[PDB]
């Protein structure tokens, strides 16, 4: 029984091995703890928004949407329909990006390196969509607690449709390279098997729950923006191993394509942010023409809007699981407390149980199938 | 509605068993993967010839910060300090006083580019379009000190990039 | 794509599909990089009358949470937090993958 340290995403991992078996797996985290939750307390809500881009930095607009929903619930306002449709469309695009990153990185760690490039070309195209809509490729900060910052450019929808009509073939190529390969199945089948009750008690969410046969999805059971107006299927696993989670993620990519099609065909007209200048800033022309608009712009960009006192816990179906925010307001324009809930935290906490009686090479597969990004884990 | 991903039961008749045995012994799926890689080998790569070719960009895209001025030549900034107040990273430092002609102008306008997050909140908070985040992104530096911009550097950046900055603003100002 | 016909058939046979139908490199089918000016309509509160802010003030309608049995101050059927969730249906588009 020898103890060895896999030092430095960035992870320190302490194990004791009995030959090839993994006996204890003690992950050491905090190598990316930047004190985001304490820094948020010194910012206004608009100022605190860009932290959520950096929390789970593979799914940026999903964290933006979760924070915006929490602030909207505390403010007792609602975004316009077009803003909600844009939010859901870009959330599905973000889910596609996140699942591409997760699947290709998991394959790369095992030893399959070519689909990484194949699908990072598509990732670059989606980054182009992000840049066109917001001016930034990755740390977008586009989704706001009143809606979205800017309306879509006049040719974005056509390019999104053009991208979406060719992505299924890329998924097909990935499946041809991975799904029926016997080496991939030997690396993934019956690895990291977790029971439904254990997953529930360990705090798992998302694919980590659905691969064990638990029929749960926050977009279906607790819909938030317009998710009750779109139709899609929830992939369900049967064995609770890495292979079932891989299949579930591929199926979620296909269903995200389906939802993107529905969103493109049903984009409504109207404004993009709540028509309430005490929360959402006015237009530039109004600010440069009307006295009230200039006053409200000044106050919103210097002090920010005040949020009525209260505490809420708002969760969404993030591409990695249930992403939640426990937001506390004291009545001022700065949040009193902001606790950030990341599914990767619970998944990494369960990594120890998931790796009992497995090879040293299986822990890498379990880490890859858990979809761990340490920005959200450490915060 | 929900879907099953791994709920297929293999057939147990002699033909399907023989097919699976042939797959196991003759390595059919590995040949399929080899064929997929071979098919990718014969298509045009997605590589562009940097730096001679450039990646597509948009007017909205945020680049290096610049201080603009009116067509008459006077700087637009009036030292309202709204960008400094809104800056989520506290990257902007501003000091001001009345000018020799009594105008409200800055004497210090510093942006720490190693603290900036390039969010663009400052340019959307500015009421006179004085501070903008221009399209330049190739401004890497050999030392930390040259990334600490003062007012002279930002005014020089504005005078250097004004043509493209104004074109981008003309393209994008109807969405703001 | 500027690929010869022989290479086209070779790659089509190697992958086993028709690739020119769905190409992964953009061409003239994309939108123009110069676009006409937009108009961006206004919201519902842009009226000149019957538009008092007191009738559309979301923040001022928030109230402190309702108090249930503050401790310091019959049949009685048992209850649940919410009605039991209905079982899902088996996706009569592609039930099995």
């Amino acid at each position: 029984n020898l103890t060895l340290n896999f030092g430095p995403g960035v992870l320190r991992l302490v194990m004791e091995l009995s030959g090839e078996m993994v006996r204890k797996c003690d992950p050491h985290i905090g190598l990316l703890h930047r004190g985001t939750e304490k820094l948020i307390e010194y910012k206004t809500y608009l100022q605190a928004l860009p932290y959520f881009d950096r929390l789970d930095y593979v799914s940026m607009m999903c964290n933006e949407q979760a924070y915006s929903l929490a602030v909207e619930k505390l403010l007792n306002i609602q975004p316009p329909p077009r803003a909600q449709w844009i939010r859901v469309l870009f959330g599905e695009i973000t889910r596609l990006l996140n699942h591409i990153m997760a699947v290709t990185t998991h394959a790369l760690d095992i030893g399959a390196m070519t689909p990484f490039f194949w699908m990072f070309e598509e990732r670059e195209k989606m980054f182009e969509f992000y840049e066109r809509v917001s001016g930034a490729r990755m740390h977008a900060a586009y989704i706001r607690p009143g809606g979205v910052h800017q309306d879509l450019p006049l040719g974005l929808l056509d390019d999104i449709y053009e991208f979406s009509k060719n992505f299924s073939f890329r998924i097909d190529e990935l499946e041809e390279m991975l799904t029926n390969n016997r080496i991939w199945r030997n690396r993934t089948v019956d690895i990291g098997v977790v029971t439904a009750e254990d997953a529930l008690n360990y705090g798992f969410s998302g694919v980590m729950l659905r691969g064990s046969g638990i029929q749960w999805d926050l977009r279906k059971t607790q819909p938030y923006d317009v998710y009750d107006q779109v139709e899609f299927d929830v992939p369900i696993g049967s064995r609770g191993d890495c292979y079932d989670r891989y299949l579930c993620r591929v199926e979620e990519m296909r269903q995200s394509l389906r939802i993107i099609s529905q969103c493109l065909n049903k984009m409504p007209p109207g404004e993009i942010k709540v028509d309430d200048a005490k929360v959402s800033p006015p237009k530039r022309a109004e600010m440069k023409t009307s006295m009230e608009s200039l006053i409200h712009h000044f106050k919103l960009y210097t002090e920010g809007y005040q949020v009525p006192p209260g505490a809420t816990y708002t969760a969404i179906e993030a591409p990695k699981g249930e992403f939640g925010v426990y937001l506390v307001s004291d009545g001022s324009s700065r949040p009193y407390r902001c606790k950030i809930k990341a599914p990767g935290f619970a998944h990494l906490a369960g990594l120890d149980k998931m790796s009992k009686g497995h090879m040293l090479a299986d822990v890498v597969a379990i880490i890859g199938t858990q979809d761990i990004v340490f920005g959200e884990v450490d915060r | 509605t929900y879907k099953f991903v791994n709920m297929r039961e293999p057939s147990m008749d002699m033909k399907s068993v023989t097919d699976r045995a042939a797959q196991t012994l003759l390595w059919t799926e590995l040949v399929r993967g080899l064929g997929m890689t071979l098919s990718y080998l014969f298509r045009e790569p997605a590589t562009i010839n940097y730096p001679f070719e450039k990646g597509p960009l948009s007017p909205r895209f945020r680049g290096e910060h610049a201080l603009r001025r009116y067509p008459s030549g006077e700087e637009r900034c009036i030292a309202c300090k709204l960008c400094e107040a809104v800056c989520p990273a506290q990257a902007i430092t501003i000091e001001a006083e009345p000018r020799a002609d009594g105008s409200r102008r800055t004497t210090r306008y510093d942006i720490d580019m190693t603290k900036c997050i390039y969010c663009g909140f400052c340019q959307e908070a500015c009421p006179v379009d004085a501070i903008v985040e221009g399209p330049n992104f190739e401004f890497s530096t050999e030392t930390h000190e040259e990334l600490l911009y003062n007012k002279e550097k930002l005014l020089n950046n504005g005078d250097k990039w004004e043509a493209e900055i104004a074109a981008n603003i003309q393209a994008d100002y109807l969405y703001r | 794509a500027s690929a010869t016909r022989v290479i086209q058939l070779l790659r089509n046979w190697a992958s086993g599909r028709d690739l020119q139908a769905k190409l992964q490199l953009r061409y003239q089918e994309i939108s123009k990089r110069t676009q006409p000016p937009p108009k961006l309509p206004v919201g519902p509160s842009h009226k000149l009358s019957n538009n008092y802010y007191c009738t559309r003030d979301g923040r001022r309608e928030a109230m402190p949470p309702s108090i249930v049995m503050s401790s310091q101050k019959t049949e009685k059927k048992a209850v649940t937090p919410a009605p039991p969730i209905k079982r899902w249906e088996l996706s009569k588009d592609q039930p099995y993958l």
Partner: peptide
């Protein structure tokens, strides 16, 4: 005078988007 102009789907909507898995069977018994 000028009417509203913003990014909208074309009249009649977009064409269908393929999303189902397509892994064909080549053929050898």
């Amino acid at each position: 005078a000028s009417k509203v102009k913003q990014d909208m789907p074309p009249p009649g909507g977009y064409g269908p988007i393929d999303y189902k898995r397509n892994l064909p069977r080549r053929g050898l018994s």
